[PDB]
Amino acid sequence: NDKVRFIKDELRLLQEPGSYVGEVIKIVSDKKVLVKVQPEGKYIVDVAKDINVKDLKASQRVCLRSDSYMLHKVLENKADPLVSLMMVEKVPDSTYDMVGG
Amino acid sequence: QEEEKKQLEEIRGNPLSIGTLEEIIDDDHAIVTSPTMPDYYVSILSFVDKELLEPGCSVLLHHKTMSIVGVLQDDADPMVSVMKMDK
Amino acid sequence: IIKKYVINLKQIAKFVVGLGERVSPTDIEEGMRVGVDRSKYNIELPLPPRIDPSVTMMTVEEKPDVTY
Amino acid sequence: MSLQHEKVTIAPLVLLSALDHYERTQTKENKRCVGVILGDANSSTIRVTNSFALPFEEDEKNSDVWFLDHNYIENMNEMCKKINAKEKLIGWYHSGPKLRASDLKINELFKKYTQNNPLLLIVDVKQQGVGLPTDAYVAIEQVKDDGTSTEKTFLHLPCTIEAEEAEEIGVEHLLRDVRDQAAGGLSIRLTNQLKSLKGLQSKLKDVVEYLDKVINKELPINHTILGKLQDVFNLLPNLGTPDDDEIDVENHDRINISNNLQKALTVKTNDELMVIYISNLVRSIIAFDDLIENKIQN
Amino acid sequence: DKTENDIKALQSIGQLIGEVMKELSEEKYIVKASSGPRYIVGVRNSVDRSKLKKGVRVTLDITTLTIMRILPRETDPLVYNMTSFEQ
Amino acid sequence: GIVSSTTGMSYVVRILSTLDRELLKPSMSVALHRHSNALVDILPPDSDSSISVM
Amino acid sequence: TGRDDTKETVYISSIALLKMLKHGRAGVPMEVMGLMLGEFVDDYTVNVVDVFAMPQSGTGVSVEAVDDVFQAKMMDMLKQTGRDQMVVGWYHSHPGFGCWLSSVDVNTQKSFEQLNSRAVAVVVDPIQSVKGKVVIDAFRLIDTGALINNLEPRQTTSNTGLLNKANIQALIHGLNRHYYSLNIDYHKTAKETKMLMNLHKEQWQSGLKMYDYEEKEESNLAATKSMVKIAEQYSKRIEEEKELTEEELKTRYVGRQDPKKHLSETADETLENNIVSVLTAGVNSVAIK
Amino acid sequence: KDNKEKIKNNRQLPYLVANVVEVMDKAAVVKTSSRQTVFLPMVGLVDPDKLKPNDLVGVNKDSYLILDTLPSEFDSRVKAMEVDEKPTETYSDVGGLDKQIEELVEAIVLPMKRADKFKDMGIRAPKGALMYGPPGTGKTLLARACAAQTNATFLKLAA
Ligand SMILES: Nc1ncnc2c1ncn2[C@@H]1O[C@H](COP(=O)(O)OP(=O)(O)OP(=O)(O)O)[C@@H](O)[C@H]1O
Ligand SMILES: [Mg+2]
């Protein structure tokens, strides 16, 4: 039963048109945050009930649902070049002794 | 308080797409450029005083029909916050 | 102006349109802005030519005063 | 006219239409319906896109007596060419139940309209057919060579269904049935194996009975059917071919891979035994703790 | 006949052309549109895949973005001129 | 996951579950349904990359 | 006190449904329009037996695109064929938008309201349907007066109903201005269902057709080789795997995209087919000869 | 008439304006002013021969088709600049440099009037003169006076 449920759930998520990504530029007391929605221009938009002006932090990257621009989740997640350089690099090998002389 | 509140929810459907006030013509209309290449000859409707608005101000416009629903911006950019390091 | 008018929008897209309530021929000139409706695409008001003077009129300062 | 009529595709909408027309004229139980079929032609695939009822009166005293309102077929055509130019006159449907020799006459009247050969689509609206309740037939003109004059006849063209993309997504969404044959799982094709045999057995009977009827009812000798049956006995598989010996080795390959894949499923089930079993052993421990933890608070 | 041509043309509806950017498979082919964005479109079994080649212009329905058939390759006057010259 | 379209409109699009995340997670061209605007299937790295193998 | 003002459940027949997907979807980007022919019974049951496309117009959909000249003309042809039934409404297609009425389509609705007060305005969005039947809705006018004096509750007295919810801007505009929506239902006969699936003789004829044996060889070879590769991985899975925390196990032994499970699936499909293959071949050989 | 009234409906404003980049030939490639590229079936009502490169055309807003033709749009800035022959500075009043005046007049004036003679002999007439070197030598000026003499419309233009 659960497998039939699972395949269906996968189906329903994908539907969602839009779905973006902004960054909280600053916070105001009006149950809103000014977001520079990154692919778009700017939007001053109200918070979703799930995550509020309290929780939000300035310069935190955020997910957004559809063309509504309601808050989904906060993303810690940041694209930076240093991080990208680390992935090429991987876990640095190797014991002191081998170097040792 | 109750006054402010009731009104604000009604008028403001969201999201609200910001503009820049380029000029005023005295007849409670303004000419603004939106982020879209077409600019829009808008009504000033409700809230913010006509006097208080001086050209070069950044402004909140309502998404269904573009109208001056107020200001809370004052040409806020992230660049100013970055620089600002009173800390 | 072709005696309807050929308008060019700022997204760059050209239409042949017409007068709305009643817009005199003599008001619409090359370079003159126009107000047209979202999607019914007709002139209401001719609008003064260009939005670019307004931008640059901020820089302009009037007759400064200093004693010689 | 045109001789390109090699394939016939049929929208399901047509099918739906043919019953609808039958009931709105209130024709029933050996009252006949003739309508125009519209669609594309002068092309190999005749694409029957639509159909529309026409004025038709049926007389039972004289079967060669009917009404058609000739002017109306012209008029209606004019309207639909304006709606969509791709639709053209392409013939006429009959509701059956069967083809007749009056349908030959009827064909002739549509021939005038049509710049293609008029397609006679026999839609049985009752759907008594086990398979296809729809036959497609094209009026051809050929010398029947036997010492008989030029004969005009309706030669069977196999037909298939087809659906436009736009309709089809909606057809599928309407349907949700488990099907007599979907080509699904083992048990489903297995049903089809029982069906397919009983199919053949009825099908062969029809042949035996025609052979009786030739010498008892004097049906005209059709040297053509009998010619095709010669090819059946002639090309017939036989045993003691080296082909049997080849099939016989093949049998052994097909069971042997099956056997090994059976054995492999044994190992997977045996794996799950262990995993669930390990959990149980742990479950014993958590259960004992419950009793142990109750003692400590007391 | 000439006034009938218009009514017919409105029912034929403007076509989008791309061009074969890159064969990927028999069943799926990568085209880049003339209008713009890159797409993966499909090919009908009505049109043989041997005809379809890299840099041949192709025509696709808007509705579903799938290649109906081949078109003759775009007429380039330049390479015609080059051939002609000598006499 | 996070992707850009052909035009660059940055979408956060769901990865249809039980697909590759062993090579998908590094950059590679990928295909998104047009209507759904979701990541429904993957492309080999060969698509839209110059063939230097000579 | 007054009127219920009740909004009909719009009972859309399958025949009518199929012509709507065909004409509208194909005709993208250009909008298409047409009337709905039906019979109205009860105060809540409208049966829309048929639809047709009225001849295209370059004004697309407007008050004047639609016409009485077109209306009458078509009626007269169907009049003779006895398939004539009263106009119960009008449809048109929006292929670029979701289900809602333009400011213009309300005015168009208003002329059909005057004709017949049970007249529906149905907005068909067919390209941005991925099942066909979805995102098509039927509507009816509500007066400007009706909104003020609060006659929206009456219409849905004692019925669960469906009020549509997709499109937030365009919907809330429609819900509180353009029209009131109620549920839209599809009905069909069990004579027709038989026709929609289509029975064929080639369903069963294909079951005694014996495909070539090169193709059986390929399947035998292929399926077995494949599971050799994931059988190495399976050895890796069960090498230890018995230390605590289940999540930990699934990343380390790559029990994500489960190799045990994939072995089972490839095995089952081939096992099932090779049994069909022996079963058909045995039936063919005795049965023929 | 039935067709013509349908055609009128399409023609009802608004409609798109576009140009014909070419006729491929039959079929026509239009370049729209919406910045997309559309290959459309050539509307047989419209003469293919009448159409030329950069012939302006009316194109229906919905299904893109060559409905009608339009007069090519014109640039008043270019029109205004044309006819600036007047005042004729006169070569006399243009300060110094006899030599350059004599040279310009060979290249320009004489071929203009003697054009029959040029055809007969068959040699090319001067296909343009470029003036270059230091400013202040009256590059401007010369052209204005010369054009006036040749009675030929003087566009003062910058690419
Ligand atoms: N040959 C001349 N005699 C007298 N005055 C001259 C002469 N040439 C130029 N000047 C004066 O200088 C002014 C400016 O000319 P300018 O320097 O623009 O010259 P030009 O040769 O046309 O160069 P350019 O267009 O490259 O700037 C003229 O309006 C004229 O009064
Ligand atoms: Mg100069």
E3, E15, E34: residue with CB nearest H45: E3
Distance CA G17, CA G138 (A): 13
The subunits that touch chain F, with at least 3 C-beta pairs less than 8 Å apart, are A, E, G
* Probe target for ligand 1 pocket from H99, H101, H140, H156, with the most ligand atoms within 8 Å of CB: H140
Which protein residue has the closest C-alpha to ligand 1 atom 12? Answer: H136
Distance CA G48, CA G41 (A): 11
Q: What's the one-letter identity of residue G49?
A: V
Contact H70, C2 (CB under 8 A): yes
Expressed as residue numbers, the domain containing D25 is 3-177
Distance CA F54, CA H12 (A): 59
Distance CA F5, CA E70 (A): 27
Distance CA B20, CA B3 (A): 28
User: Which atom number of ligand 1 is nearest to the Cα of residue H134?
Assistant: 21
Ligand 2 centroid distance, CA of C49 (Å)? 30
The nearest alpha carbon in chain C to H13 belongs to: C17
Q: How was this structure determined?
A: cryo-EM
Ligand 1 centroid distance, CA of H140 (Å)? 7
A18, A21, A64: residue with CB nearest F37: A18
Ligand 1 centroid distance, CA of A89 (Å)? 67
Does H19 reach chain G within 8 Å, measured CB to CB?
Answer: no
Length, in residues, of chain B:
87
**Token digits for D91?**
């013939």
* Probe target for ligand 1 pocket from H100, H137, H142, H146, with the most ligand atoms within 8 Å of CB: H137
Distance CA H138, CA H143 (A): 9
**Distance from CA of residue G99 to its chain's centroid?**
14
Q: Which residues pair with D138 in a beta bridge?
A: D119, D155
Considering only CB atoms, which chain F residues are within 8 Å of A14?
A: 14, 16, 33, 36, 38-40
Contact E57, E67 (CB under 8 A): no
User: Which atom number of ligand 1 is nearest to the Cα of residue H140?
Assistant: 22
Distance CA F17, CA F42 (A): 12
Ligand 2 centroid distance, CA of H90 (Å)? 16
Write phi, then psi, for E56 (nearest 5 degrees).
-85, 140
- Helix locations, E1-87, DSSP H: 2-12, 77-84
Distance CA H47, CA H58 (A): 14
Distance CA E28, CA E39 (A): 10
Residues of E with CB under 8 A from a CB of H: 1-10, 12-17, 34-36, 59, 71, 74-75
The SS3 call for residue D250 is helix
Distance CA G120, CA G144 (A): 18
Neighbours of ion ligand 2 (CB under 5 A): H 140
The subunits that touch chain E, with at least 3 C-beta pairs less than 8 Å apart, are D, F, G, H
Contact G288, D200 (CB under 8 A): no
Distance CA D154, CA D108 (A): 12
CATH of residue D121: 3.40.140.10
Looking from the CA of A47 toward its CB, the CA atoms found within 13 Å total: 20
Cis, peptide link before residue G29, omega less than 30° from 0: yes
Q: Distances from the Cα of G206 to the Cαs of D50, G198, G202, in angstroms?
A: 29, 16, 6
User: Is the shortest distance between the CB of H133 and ligand 1 below 6 Å?
Assistant: no
Contact E44, E66 (CB under 8 A): yes
**Token digits for D298?**
């007391």
Which protein residue has the closest C-alpha to ligand 1 atom 14? Answer: H136
Going by their DSSP bridges, the two strands D160-161 and D7-10 should be labelled as parallel
User: Is the shortest distance between the CB of H135 and ligand 1 below 6 Å?
Assistant: yes
Distance CA G146, CA G218 (A): 71
The nearest alpha carbon in chain D to E5 belongs to: D85
CB contact under 8 A, E38 and F5: no
Contact G73, D79 (CB under 8 A): yes
Distance CA G127, CA G96 (A): 8
User: Is the shortest distance between the CB of H96 and ligand 1 below 6 Å?
Assistant: yes
Does H6 reach chain G within 8 Å, measured CB to CB?
Answer: yes
User: Is the shortest distance between the CB of H140 and ligand 1 below 6 Å?
Assistant: yes
Q: Distances from the Cα of A56 to the Cαs of A24, A32, A34, C15, G67, in angstroms?
A: 8, 10, 11, 47, 58
Distance CA A42, CA A45 (A): 9
**Token digits for D171?**
């057809």
Asked if chain B contacts chain E via 3 or more Cβ pairs within 8 Å, the reply is no
Does F49 reach chain E within 8 Å, measured CB to CB?
Answer: no
DSSP state of D117: P
G79 closest CA partner among D79, D89, D72: D72
CA G15-G16-G18 angle, to 5 degrees, is 65
The Cα of B73 is separated from the nearest Cα of chain A by a number of Å equal to 9
Q: Please give the resolution of this entry in Å, rounded to 1 decimal.
A: 7.7
Considering only CB atoms, which chain B residues are within 8 Å of A59?
A: 78
Residues of B with CB under 8 A from a CB of C: 22-23, 31, 33, 36-39, 41, 55-56
Which protein residue has the closest C-alpha to ligand 1 atom 5? Answer: H95
Ligand 1 centroid distance, CA of H150 (Å)? 22
User: Which atom number of ligand 1 is nearest to the Cα of residue H97?
Assistant: 1
Q: What is the 3-state secondary structure (H, E, C) of D195-235?
A: HHHHHHHHHHHHHHHHHHHHCCCCCCCCHHHHHHHHHHHHC
User: Which atom number of ligand 1 is nearest to the Cα of residue H141?
Assistant: 22
Cα separation of the two ends of chain G: 83
Distance CA D186, CA G171 (A): 48
Cis, peptide link before residue A17, omega less than 30° from 0: no
Does E62 reach chain D within 8 Å, measured CB to CB?
Answer: no
**Token digits for E43?**
């090919």
Considering only CB atoms, which chain E residues are within 8 Å of G127?
A: 63
Structure-derived torsion over alpha carbons of residues D33, D34, D37, D42, reported in degrees to the nearest 10: 140
Give the H or E element holding residue D34.
Answer: strand D34-40
The nearest alpha carbon in chain G to B13 belongs to: G169
Ligand 2 centroid distance, CA of H138 (Å)? 6
The subunits that touch chain C, with at least 3 C-beta pairs less than 8 Å apart, are B, H
CB contact under 8 A, H37 and E17: yes
Ligand 2 centroid distance, CA of G136 (Å)? 68
Neighbours of D1 (CB within 10 A): 10
Q: What is the DSSP string of chain G?
A: --------EEEEEHHHHHHHHHHHHHSTTS--EEEEEEEEETTTEEEEEEE------TT-SSTTTS-HHHHHHHHHHHHHHT----EEEEEEE-SSS-S---HHHHHHHHHHHHH-TT-EEEEE--TT-SSSSSSEEEEE---HHHHHHT-HHHHTTT---------SHHHHHIIIII-EE--EEEE--TTHHHHHH---SHHHHTTT----SHHHHHHHHHHHHHHHHHHHHHHHHTSS--SS-HHHHHHHTT-TT-HHHHHHHHHHHHHHHHHHHHHHHHHHHHHH-
Domain boundaries, chain G: 7-186, 212-289
Which protein residue has the closest C-alpha to ligand 1 atom 4? Answer: H95
Distance CA G271, CA G264 (A): 10
* Residue B82: partners with Cβ closer than 8 Å, 6 or more residues away: none
* Probe target for ligand 1 pocket from H97, H104, H141, H144, with the most ligand atoms within 8 Å of CB: H141
Identify the residue among D78, D80, D165, D167 best suited for mutation to test binding to E, counting E beta carbons within 10 A and taking the highest.
D165
Q: What is the 3-state secondary structure (H, E, C) of chain H?
A: CHHHHHHHHHHCCCEEEEEEEEECCCEEEEEECCCCEEEEECCCCCCCCCCCCCEEEEECCCCCCEEEECCCCCCHHHHHHCCCCCCCCCCCCCCCCHHHHHHHHHHCHHHHHCHHHHHHHCCCCCCCCCCCCCCCCCHHHHHHHHHHHCCCCCCCCCC
User: Is the shortest distance between the CB of H145 and ligand 1 below 6 Å?
Assistant: no
Asked if chain D contacts chain B via 3 or more Cβ pairs within 8 Å, the reply is no
D-E contacts (CB, under 8 Å): 9
User: Is the shortest distance between the CB of H100 and ligand 1 below 6 Å?
Assistant: no
CB contact under 8 A, F47 and E65: no
D4 closest CA partner among D147, D136, D117: D117
Does B20 reach chain A within 8 Å, measured CB to CB?
Answer: no
User: Is the shortest distance between the CB of H93 and ligand 1 below 6 Å?
Assistant: no
Q: What's the one-letter identity of residue D262?
A: Q
A-B contacts (CB, under 8 Å): 40
Q: Distances from the Cα of H102 to the Cαs of D65, H107, H108, H146, in angstroms?
A: 103, 9, 10, 11
- Helix locations, chain F, DSSP H: none
